[PDB]
């Protein structure tokens, strides 16, 4: 399997056209805020392909 | 796309804003493709002993 390519799952807001996003912060979906511990309702945005 | 438009004008006044009217011409258009939030203009200092 090729694990050298990643994709961003979700984002909080939108993006402008002709814009590259390089933010690898911990995504927050709902409550229980993350602050870099990756607990409940804390999913990583970059996920591996298949 | 970050666009810079330049013009030089040989004024001769003491202070404040000069009068008159002129146009603006392009110099370069660099397609960086990123947004800019804040900017700061850096000056220089003269050093002597």
Swiss-Prot record, chain A:
Upon changing residue 40 to V, the result is: In strain: Omicron/BA.4, Omicron/BA.5, Omicron/BQ.1.1
Using the UniProt annotation, give all residue ranges assigned to the region (Disordered).
9-44
Annotated region described as Immunodominant HLA epitope recognized by the CD8+, given as residue ranges: 2-10
Q: Which Cys residues form disulphide pairs?
A: 34-42
Q: Where is this region: Receptor-binding motif?
A: 1-50
Subunit annotation: Binds to host ACE2. RBD also interacts with the N-linked glycan on 'Asn-90' of ACE2. Cleavage of S generates a polybasic C-terminal sequence on S1 that binds to host Neuropilin-1 (NRP1) and Neuropilin-2 (NRP2) receptors. Interacts with host integrin alpha-5/beta-1 (ITGA5:ITGB1) and with ACE2 in complex with integrin alpha-5/beta-1 (ITGA5:ITGB1). May interact via cytoplasmic c-terminus with M protein. May interact (via N-terminus) with host bilirubin and biliverdin, thereby preventing antibody binding to the SARS-CoV-2 spike NTD via an allosteric mechanism.
Q: What does this protein do?
A: Attaches the virion to the cell membrane by interacting with host receptor, initiating the infection. The major receptor is host ACE2. When S2/S2' has been cleaved, binding to the receptor triggers direct fusion at the cell membrane. When S2/S2' has not been cleaved, binding to the receptor results in internalization of the virus by endocytosis using host TFRC and GRM2 and leading to fusion of the virion membrane with the host endosomal membrane. Alternatively, may use NRP1/NRP2 and integrin as entry receptors.
Q: What is this protein called?
A: Spike protein S1
**Which species does the entry assign this protein to?**
Severe acute respiratory syndrome coronavirus 2 (2019-nCoV)
Q: Which stretch of the intact protein is present? A: 447 to 496 of 1273
